[PDB]
From Swiss-Prot, chain A:
Post-translational modification: Phosphorylated on tyrosine residues; which may be important for nuclear import.
Name of the molecule in the record: Proteasome subunit alpha type-2
Described function: Component of the 20S core proteasome complex involved in the proteolytic degradation of most intracellular proteins. This complex plays numerous essential roles within the cell by associating with different regulatory particles. Associated with two 19S regulatory particles, forms the 26S proteasome and thus participates in the ATP-dependent degradation of ubiquitinated proteins.
Top-level taxon of the source organism: Eukaryota
Keywords: Acetylation, Cytoplasm, Nucleus, Phosphoprotein, Proteasome
From Swiss-Prot, chain D:
Keywords: Acetylation, Cytoplasm, Host-virus interaction, Nucleus, Proteasome
Organism this protein belongs to: Homo sapiens
Record's note on what induces expression: Up-regulated in asthenozoospermic sperm.
Similarity remark: Belongs to the peptidase T1B family.
Biological processes, Gene Ontology terms: proteasome-mediated ubiquitin-dependent protein catabolic process
The organism's taxonomic lineage, starting at the top: Eukaryota, Metazoa, Chordata, Craniata, Vertebrata
N6-acetyllysine: modified positions: K76
InterPro entries with a match to the protein in the record: Ntn_hydrolases_N, Proteasome_beta_3, Proteasome_bsu_CS, Proteasome_sua/b, Proteasome_suB-type
Protein name per UniProt: Proteasome subunit beta type-3
Family matches, as PROSITE patterns: PROTEASOME_BETA_1, PROTEASOME_BETA_2
Gene3D superfamilies to which the protein is assigned, alphabetical: Glutamine Phosphoribosylpyrophosphate, subunit 1, domain 1
Primary gene name: PSMB3
Locations listed in the record: Cytoplasm; Nucleus
Swiss-Prot record, chain E:
Domain of life: Eukaryota
Compartments where found: Nucleus; Cytoplasm, Cytosol
Function noted in UniProt: Component of the 26S proteasome, a multiprotein complex involved in the ATP-dependent degradation of ubiquitinated proteins. This complex plays a key role in the maintenance of protein homeostasis by removing misfolded or damaged proteins, which could impair cellular functions, and by removing proteins whose functions are no longer required. Therefore, the proteasome participates in numerous cellular processes, including cell cycle progression, apoptosis, or DNA damage repair. In the complex, PSMD11 is required for proteasome assembly.
Protein family membership: Belongs to the proteasome subunit S9 family.
Gene from which this protein is expressed: PSMD11
Location of this fragment in the whole protein: 43 to 159 of 422
Regulation: induction: By FOXO4; expression in embryonic stem cells (ESCs) is mediated by FOXO4.
Outcome recorded upon mutating S37A: Does not affect phosphorylation by AMPK
Protein name: 26S proteasome non-ATPase regulatory subunit 11
Tissue localization of expression: Highly expressed in embryonic stem cells (ESCs). Expression decreases as ESCs differentiate.
Subunit (UniProt): Component of the 19S proteasome regulatory particle complex. The 26S proteasome consists of a 20S core particle (CP) and two 19S regulatory subunits (RP). The regulatory particle is made of a lid composed of 9 subunits including PSMD11, a base containing 6 ATPases and few additional components.
Intrachain disulfide bonds: none
From Swiss-Prot, chain F:
List of residues that carry Phosphoserine: S238
Keyword set, alphabetical order: Acetylation, Cytoplasm, Host-virus interaction, Nucleus, Phosphoprotein, Proteasome
Gene coding for it: PSMA3
Modified residues (N6-acetyllysine): K52, K201, K225
Name the record gives this protein: Proteasome subunit alpha type-3
Organism: Homo sapiens (Human)
Taxonomic lineage: Eukaryota, Metazoa, Chordata, Craniata, Vertebrata
Amino acid sequence: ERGYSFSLTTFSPSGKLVQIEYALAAVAGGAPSVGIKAANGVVLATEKKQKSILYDERSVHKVEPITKHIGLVYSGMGPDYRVLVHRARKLAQQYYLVYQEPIPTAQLVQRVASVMQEYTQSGGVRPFGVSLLICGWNEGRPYLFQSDPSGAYFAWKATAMGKNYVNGKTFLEKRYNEDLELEDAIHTAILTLKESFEGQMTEDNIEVGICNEAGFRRLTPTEVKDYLAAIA
Amino acid sequence: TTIAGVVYKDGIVLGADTRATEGMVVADKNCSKIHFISPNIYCCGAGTAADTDMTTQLISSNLELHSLSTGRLPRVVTANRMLKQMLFRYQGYIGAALVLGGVDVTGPHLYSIYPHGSTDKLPYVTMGSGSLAAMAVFEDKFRPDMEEEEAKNLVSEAIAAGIFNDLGSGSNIDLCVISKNKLDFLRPYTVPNKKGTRLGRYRCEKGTTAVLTEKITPLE
Amino acid sequence: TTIMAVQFDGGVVLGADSRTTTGSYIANRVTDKLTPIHDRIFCCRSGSAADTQAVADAVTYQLGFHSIELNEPPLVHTAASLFKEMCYRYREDLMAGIIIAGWDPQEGGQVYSVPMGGMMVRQSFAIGGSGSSYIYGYVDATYREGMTKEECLQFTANALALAMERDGSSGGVIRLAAIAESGVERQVLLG
Amino acid sequence: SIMSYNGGAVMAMKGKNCVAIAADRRFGIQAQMVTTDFQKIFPMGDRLYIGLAGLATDVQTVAQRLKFRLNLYELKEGRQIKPYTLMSMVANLLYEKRFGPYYTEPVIAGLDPKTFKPFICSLDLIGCPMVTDDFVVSGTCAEQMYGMCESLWEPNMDPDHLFETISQAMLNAVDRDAVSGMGVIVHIIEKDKITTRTLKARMD
Amino acid sequence: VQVKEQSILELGSLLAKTGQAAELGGLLKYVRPFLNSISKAKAARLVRSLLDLFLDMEAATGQEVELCLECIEWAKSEKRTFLRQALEARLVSLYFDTKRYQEALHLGSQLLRELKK
Amino acid sequence: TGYDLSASTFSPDGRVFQVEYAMKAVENSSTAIGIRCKDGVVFGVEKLVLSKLYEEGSNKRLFNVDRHVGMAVAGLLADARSLADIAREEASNFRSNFGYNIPLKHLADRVAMYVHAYTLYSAVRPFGCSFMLGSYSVNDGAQLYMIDPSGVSYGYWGCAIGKARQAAKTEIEKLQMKEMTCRDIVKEVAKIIYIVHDEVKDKAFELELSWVGELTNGRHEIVPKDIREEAEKYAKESLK
Amino acid sequence: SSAGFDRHITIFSPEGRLYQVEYAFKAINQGGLTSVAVRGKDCAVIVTQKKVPDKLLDSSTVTHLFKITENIGCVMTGMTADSRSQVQRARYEAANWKYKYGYEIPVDMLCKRIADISQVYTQNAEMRPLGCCMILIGIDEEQGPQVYKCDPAGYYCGFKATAAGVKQTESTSFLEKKVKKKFDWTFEQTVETAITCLSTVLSIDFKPSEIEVGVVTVENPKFRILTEAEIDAHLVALAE
């Protein structure tokens, strides 16, 4: 490059930022996803489709692990997702080289959102088009956080993103209670993902990852075929 | 410091003592010199203490980073290639005499790494101060394709020769067996040397020490 | 350490000992002194151990990329140039003696010598290493121009056996390799 | 030597549900004392201390740099620091100065912030984290301190006999040393409270 | 554990195919504590499937409505939402098989006060 | 319009007009052909003289990159002398690292990457040049290559650059290519330059011929031009 | 609609889209070419025609079938100048996997490294996003054959049989009808379907001179470009 470095995101005359609001529009028209925190573990459930019978499902993965106990899904766009995965992978290593201890889940999200915000103020680039759902069972209590293209973190009990997320939002508002078990959380997570799905819900149309206090665990399609018997 | 390692018909047996001397004074009666790299690869270190620590944590970081990206399994030749390329870059100013061993998809592999960067692929290696004593037991007693109990008897014999015939090795024996599926890690394996008991009460009554100024600060 | 390379009417014949010392102690009884760079081009390294392993990887990297791009089997003289460029540039930091020998489709069998200064010269036969000073007289009275392959295998076998006997730093076992148009024939002897 | 330029002695001993730490009180230049109240034990929170010995420059510098990283750590998080994390933090700070190191040998002794479990460790001048279960020593008069604690240590010790043991350990080891002395301070900490006593030593 | 699961499911499928309800309904009364061995959402499909194989034997309504009230009052004690809803939906289907008049409609009004809520 | 200012933007249907604009800049230049016979490559450039306007032998477009490599540039002449410095500099570093002569397949690739690199950014513009690469080697025969301003570079037997592009290669393919000595090809080149470009716009024009092959031992040089001069004597035999 | 400069640089639209990248998807179709990839049970076929407009042009320097490593081949569609720049990146990072890691790179891991680079070109606004596609084949240990496709947006996935180029929606519609009927796939069963799909979509019924076949096999993992004779051998064999 040359030395331009001019930020292409400035304030509106109203006083809002324009490109971040447009980046949120790309997230809302993405694949639906749901995450539920249920007092012994946290369950991530995304919704994976294939436009043909020609694609392969053992290749592209949505639920992606980070350390040994920290999972991560998204709802926005695809190529930008893999960037900040590899960024967060290295970002958890400088914690572990220095402190010799697995990084707490709150400590990642402070660092990932700091990457993402500082990315928007600098010049020549667009913001990301990805929102995240990060979870983990650190120090007894499990956790569930959500980031955004603006770079703001939250702490949900149960949220949803992607298409028709407000419909899934009201559904969890009646479905979720003070506490459940892990298996009940999986049963209501498939229930809310079956809200806006299509007719074929096989072991390949959904893709589910959990966080035990024993650790992160990604579910193979065998159990998801077995657990979808009398689903929702 | 005395480390060794051998390849039997299925897996790999590693072994070390537990003693870190500082000059000519025993600074640690129980150290830990078998390090983690991956769920199928361990490593043993010798020479400088801190330089083997910070190196073997860096490579265990990168292979965890690599294998989580590929999603398959680490390989021992990858751990060999990262180490010899790093140590050669620092011109041998980092004292790290390693023994690398693990079981891949291909099979068991054993490596000796010198701190200038030269590496070897051997069926049995010894490093450290009491390495010349340990190589005497390996060469007099070795056959290809041993059993697991034959190998575990052999390495503990070689480490015990390093203890009883050298001043840098003086304590408990560690082992580690890495087969194709089983990972055994035995920190007390053999205690050859005890400590003699005390025959005299030396404790005086409480208040046998003159105190100038005391101070109490309560906590929560 | 003693390395050996003799060319003949077809390809070449390489040979080395296997004994790695750390000054008076044998750190390794058996050592692959010789290294496959490409499918028809070997080298056989001497001097330091960490240095020569470092150079032989980088040359294998650069020649491998160059030959895929050119989509042909490379030249032995091309590979000999790459050892020259590194060992001359870092002649203050490398103690390496390399003999490159390999078969080539353009020019048959070739043997080059890159000693510790960083020069390069084609020879009919070429020796090197710490034990190579003891067989100068034998290799000059026994070499005859126009040998077959099996004569060269017998020639390098007697030449390495003398230096292993007389030098202390050389010994172990003998590794041989015959590179030709057909294949690479590798064997391990004693005697 | 460079370690023998100012002198020093730091001992930490593990008790039953408590841990004690001690140091001497001398600041001098190779034969000539200057003051009698040089601080070598620094607080790093509650029920978690650190002692430093060696060169008096690197005693003061590293104790400030460690406090710099520690106050940032407890603000970016909500909790206090675990004693393993402090040991990894110090071993990072020493290994960064790999070629020209800080001439010091830190000794960490604290309790659990979650329970009362005691912890002791000591490091090299380049950061080898050696932990023990009985005692750690550091300083110029190191071998005399091994003469005491190998001979005077029992597993399950109330804080009374823990105080009486570490006091007789320091007073006999330091008074054999030439460049250490001029008073001994002892911090004995536990779950309830913290006791600081200053012993009666030879002032020569 | 699992070898006793497939042995009683073998015997449970045996009692259905032959055609006796005393041996089968005795088994359904027996396996009531065994429901607290598996997932609370996987158990309900099994209870549904065992109830259907109980019903599709012979029109003997002396005990069919009696086993239903046992399971509902068991779910009133055990407090599962999906279980009691699965039992009510079968029970009102049973009443329409018997052509009942108000108590079918009374019950169906009671569920809609909860189901759509 | 609106999309045709930078080399970084695409069109709404998906092309780049700045490359499209530079292609027709080369098209408005004089004619240069290149043809290989069975043991060499012959270059031919029609070169215009306005009235006097220079010497006899200024600003020749037959550059000489390597000892065995030729050029036949046409287009914007200032940028052509830049590529000749780049292609010269590339072959030298091949000689330095390696130490056999540069193959022509690489030298087409290594140059065309540098052409392609100027078609990405809004800082620089595309080159307005196009040219021929001719070599000969006893291990590889003769090869003839051809680079456009986009960077698309591959092999030909006969090509032609300039205004007379489709009009010149109409009759190149009428000849033979394998059954020809290049000395026969030399006078065959000169008629095609003499056939095309009637002197309606430009009265005076030169004819520079260059010639690498078996007879020149792989060394590239100009033809003996004032010597023996058999091209133009044979070329003007086509008055009817 | 258009806000700011969303038609020009890679920023967002008010509709939550962008436009430069989806212009680049139909920057392939100016190439005018269609390539088909089919994976069988123990093989992986790549088939691609070529158009030879000039008789004065070689039949050697044209074919898009490239060789990344000894066990990985590819095919390129889109424009040609952007294609060969993409291939040198793939050749370069395959070799760095050897030097860093020691073993041969998987065909899956290479598509991550390519799609990351195409991501960044989308990402920073002052550079062009390189419109050309990418299809790889190769044999993995304990995984069999694989077929992947990098895209100029920056995403990839595995496939069983998937074409690219100009004609996909007729070519993929035929391959779905071929796969979902659950037939056998051995070697020549896989090659014949890769021809007849490209035969029926293009509706040509050609002479064995335009297409090239780049099969890799479990028994022979070397990337191999088929001879024109044996290409004719398969074509008359499936002919009844």
